Design a protein around this ligand. Structure first.
Ligand code: YBV
Length: 120
C-alpha cells in the first residue's frame, strides 16, 4: 500500500517529527504506560539484560526523537515494538506488565494508523 511504502521509504520531515512527538506524548500519558516510561531496573527482573537483546523504553525513544535519530517511520515503529515484544518475551502472560504491553500496543497501533494517514 501507499502507507506501507511511505513508512519504509519516505524520510521523516519536520512536520512528521511534530506528529511523532504527539504520538510519543500520547503513549507517555496513557494510564498503562508507567511500566515503560524508564528502563527496567535489574532488581525488578532477574537476568533481564542477559535475556533481552535490545532493551527499549519510552524515555530512550524520547531522547532519540529529540536528537532526530529516526530517519524513517519504520525505525520509530521498530523501537516502540521492542518495548512491547521485550515485555511479552521476558514475562509470563499473566504478569501485569504483559497485560500493560497488550493494552498500550493496541493504543499505539491506533495512534500509528492515524499518524500514517496524516502524512498524505
Ligand atoms: C519484568 N519487568 N520489570 C519492570 C518493568 N518496568 C519497570 C520500569 N519501572 C517499572 C517491566 Cl516493563 C518489566 O517487564
Amino acid at each position: 500500500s501507499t502507507e506501507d511504502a511511505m513508512t519504509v521509504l519516505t524520510p521523516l520531515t519536520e512536520k512528521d517529527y511534530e506528529g511523532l512527538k504527539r504520538v510519543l506524548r500520547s503513549l507517555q500519558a496513557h494510564k498503562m504506560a508507567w511500566p515503560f516510561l524508564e528502563p527496567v531496573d535489574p532488581n525488578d527482573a532477574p537476568d533481564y539484560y542477559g535475556v533481552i537483546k535490545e532493551p527499549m523504553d519510552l524515555a530512550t525513544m524520547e531522547e532519540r526523537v529529540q536528537r532526530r535519530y529516526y530517519e524513517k517511520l519504520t525505525e520509530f515503529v521498530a523501537d516502540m515494538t521492542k518495548i512491547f515484544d521485550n515485555c511479552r518475551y521476558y514475562n509470563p502472560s499473566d504478569s501485569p506488565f504483559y497485560q500493560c504491553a497488550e493494552v498500550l500496543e493496541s493504543f499505539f497501533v491506533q495512534k500509528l494508523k492515524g499518524f500514517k494517514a496524516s502524512r498524505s
